[PDB]
Amino acid sequence: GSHMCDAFVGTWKLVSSENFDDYMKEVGVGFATRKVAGMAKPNMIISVNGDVITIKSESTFKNTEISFILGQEFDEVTADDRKVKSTITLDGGVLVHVQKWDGKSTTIKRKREDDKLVVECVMKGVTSTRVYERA
């Protein structure tokens, strides 16, 4: 086993969101995509197989899937169709995901807190908090 497996692996459902529209504005997402994406209630499926972590997000808006090794950069196409270079590390028990594109950067942190998986998305001064619980 591993810390990663015990903390994050499973199937999670979105239960609350704060400031996600404002986060998406700051990222540069256009009006129509913000409206449809902001309505979504994704499930987050996290798995581990050896060194490879997979995070899948399934919703009525888009389905995404990333697979990666901690510390090792990869190319990602986000739900809003940005082509980013991503690096994900596990720092003090928090998954830290940095996306770089067009000279810009956003950081997504995933944390266990009580029975929740808390996602914090930061773009310059703007944070969105999205709370997931086990399905």
How many degrees, rounded to 5, is the angle at CA 59 between CA 85 and CA 52?
A: 45
CA dist 122 and 117 (Å) reads 16
Contact between 95 and ligand Q29 by CB under 6 A: the answer reads no
Beta carbon nearer to ligand Q29, 24 or 53: 24
Q: Are 35 and 60 in contact (CB under 8 A)?
A: no
Helix (H) or strand (E) holding 8, with range, is helix 3-8
- Residue 23 assigned to a binding site: no
Determine the length of the chain: 135
Contact pick of 46, 88, 117, 119 for ligand Q29 (by CB under 6 A): 119
Shortest reach from residue 28's CB to ligand Q29, in Å:
8
How many degrees, rounded to 5, is the angle at CA 71 between CA 6 and CA 61?
A: 70
Beta carbon nearer to ligand Q29, 1 or 17: 17
Contact pick of 88, 95, 117, 121 for ligand Q29 (by CB under 6 A): 121
Tokens describing residue 14: 């979105």
Residues 24-83 that bind ligand Q29 (CB under 6 A): 24, 27, 29, 33, 37, 42, 57, 78-80
Site of interaction with ligand Q29 (CB under 6 A): 14, 24, 27, 29, 33, 37, 42, 57, 78-80, 108, 119, 121, 130
Binding site for a fatty acid, by residue number, is 130-132
